[PDB]
Write a protein that binds this ligand. Sequence first.
Ligand SMILES: [Mg+2]
Lengths: 206, 206
Amino acid sequence: MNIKLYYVHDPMCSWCWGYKPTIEKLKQQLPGVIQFEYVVGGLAPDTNLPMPPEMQQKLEGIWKQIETQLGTKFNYDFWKLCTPVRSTYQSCRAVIAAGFQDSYEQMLEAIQHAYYLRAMPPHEEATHLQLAKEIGLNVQQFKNDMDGTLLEGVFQDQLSLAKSLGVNSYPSLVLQINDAYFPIEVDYLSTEPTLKLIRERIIENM
Amino acid sequence: MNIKLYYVHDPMCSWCWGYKPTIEKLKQQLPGVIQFEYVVGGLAPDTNLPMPPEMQQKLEGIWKQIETQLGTKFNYDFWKLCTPVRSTYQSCRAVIAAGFQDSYEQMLEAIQHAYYLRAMPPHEEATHLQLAKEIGLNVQQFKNDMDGTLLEGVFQDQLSLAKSLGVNSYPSLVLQINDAYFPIEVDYLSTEPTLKLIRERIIENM
Ligand SMILES: [Mg+2]
């Protein structure tokens, strides 16, 4: 029997940044027989149009919700210092490209820190290349990888997979057992109920 | 995947009687893939040696501990009304003979109630016959099965199975997953920690 937990996220998703300490603990605690697979869900298509000011006020107020409920840190200067753009695809391509040099998780964290703490635009090339350097990547290979057809192939496969798993919001977990798929509820604060749900599913399917 | 939970017990073990409501709940709650198997371990070989006063007092003090810790019921008149004998192989034969007529659990409970509640001597043949009659067994067949070499064989095989499973004392639980065996700690007051131990072990071996 073949068992996999998909974690469907976006580097620019606020709740996923709120979820970070728990999903990392979850992945560490998961039994070794379960593969863990990240899937970018692709929160917003490529675009250069600046975010209209109502959408900016909304997203800012969501950061404050997450801070209140989860204790998550945000540098609110992002809304003052940057021109926010509703576009997340480049940041998904950056994490996948970093994954080619075995640094998927290091780049994911670096983009979340950039966006939520460092007041840096997470959709910009300048940010991605500055992060690639900081994280120790071969910057030139990372830049060629971002622009190659191999990466658009991988990226497209993950966007289709997120829709195929039935995911329309982030973060989401889906557990696969052979040919069957089971959504798993996210618990933001604790790993214990999530592991219970996973073990229970596996055992009901034996 | 072949999964089996062995419960190793003796009808005349007083902690097994203290365990009874929890082990019965456990057996009801077990996921359907796990088979439950009773194994008699044979606390003490056949004998007529009278239990002397110091051991009668030690065993009665254990009954009090069990009552204090678990709320278990005892009729202490056993200690005034009977001549106790530490001899349990016959009582193990009796539950196996009742199992030949699909009444293993009914005879096990009738022996516990006879010993702990009815102040009846649990090692005496007259007790076994009386319980066989009270639970509605074919009494003639029960006596033939008790005296036969067939039952002696099944009984010796249980004594060897219990020792093979690593068990010297009761109650004990051992989980078999294919060819691997895992001791599972007993929790006298609830099933939830024990089910979690079982689920964790199964997922850790697949
Ligand atoms: Mg004795």
